[PDB]
């Protein structure tokens, strides 16, 4: 019932332009939990099953079976955006703490928050 | 000439729904410089002149005197998104390193990172 960091929602990302990821697809909540409770928006990262294995240090793999996907997929920590919460359709699952640690790490690389 | 972290571009964020920020407005590039050089997208954070003082730990102020702005503004590190580079029109300015340290900090607060 509350939006928590690490939750996997199905959400409507369209319309998009060019290389932006759109459609209705799984996304992961990456905003801190204070913003998730009180802000009118959430910050998410997109999941695509267009690749099933990672090719980039900012990519994180999600098992299809464990996290209720149709296909083995990957979190694109380079494809992130702020959504009005009305964009969140369905909450599918939520990531393990160890998967959120790989997500934290990939977000630091993608956003230039470490060294490098 | 290359897109750099800390560069402030004019970009088209439209169309949006509800509480998402849209329009054609300044943004600060927050993606790393390896990604800014080779990927077809950048990650930006939106700037508003609807407020001139910060009200949230994920807000960072920009002063009209230092940067090519229309008004004293504030960076909203909760309104961030990935944009295809064709969405970037003009390069306006770039932030100081000291101002970028405040950006990093609010980004760690905004995104639930502590390291």
């Amino acid at each position, epitope marked *: 019932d509350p939006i928590r960091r690490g939750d996997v929602y199905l959400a409507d990302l369209s319309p998009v332009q060019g290389s932006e990821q759109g459609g209705v697809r799984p996304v992961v909540i990456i905003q801190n939990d*204070t*913003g998730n*409770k*009180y*802000s*009118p928006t959430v910050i998410v990262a997109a999941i695509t099953g267009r690749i099933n294995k990672a090719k980039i240090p900012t990519h994180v793999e999600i098992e299809k079976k464990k996290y209720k996907l149709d296909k083995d997929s990957v979190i694109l920590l380079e494809q992130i955006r702020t959504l009005d*919460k009305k964009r969140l359709k369905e909450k599918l699952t939520y990531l393990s703490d160890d998967k959120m640690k790989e997500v934290d790490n990939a977000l630091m690389i993608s956003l230039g928050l470490n060294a490098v | 000439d290359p897109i750099r972290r800390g560069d402030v571009y004019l970009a088209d964020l439209s169309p949006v729904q509800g509480s998402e920020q849209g329009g054609v407005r300044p943004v600060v590039i927050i993606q790393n410089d390896t990604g800014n050089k080779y990927s077809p997208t950048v990650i930006v954070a939106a700037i508003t002149g609807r407020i001139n*003082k*910060a*009200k*949230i*730990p994920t807000h960072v102020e920009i002063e009209k005197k230092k940067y090519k702005l229309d008004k004293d503004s504030v960076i909203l590190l909760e309104q961030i998104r990935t944009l295809d580079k064709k969405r970037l029109k003009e390069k306006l300015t770039y932030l100081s390193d000291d101002k970028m340290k405040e950006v990093d900090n609010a980004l760690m*607060i905004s995104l639930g990172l502590n390291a």
Partner: nanobody
Amino acid sequence: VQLQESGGGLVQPGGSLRLSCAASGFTFDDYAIGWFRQAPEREGVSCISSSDGSTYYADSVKGRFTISSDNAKNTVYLQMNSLKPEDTAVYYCAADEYLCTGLAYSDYYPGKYEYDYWGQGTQVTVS
């Protein structure tokens, strides 16, 4: 833009009160409203966000106070039960776009942020 409160006064410990805050010259759904208090430092007590109705309560009044809103009368109420003498203070209602996420952030990050609209304050004495 005016915030007129009411409901303050003297009460015996263990009693209850209902404070009111009346909003005037803004859009009730475009602003978040809450309650601050100051005993002879200024702390935020409660807040209610326009959309979603998400509430914030300071820890020292959790379970004891209750905030609510009547969108027709543009009025926020603060129902204070089981009142303690530590609650004795001047209670101000305030309004801002970020007041609620700001009040919650101040539990984790030290800050000093100015918010837009402030009321006159009403004295709440518990003795």
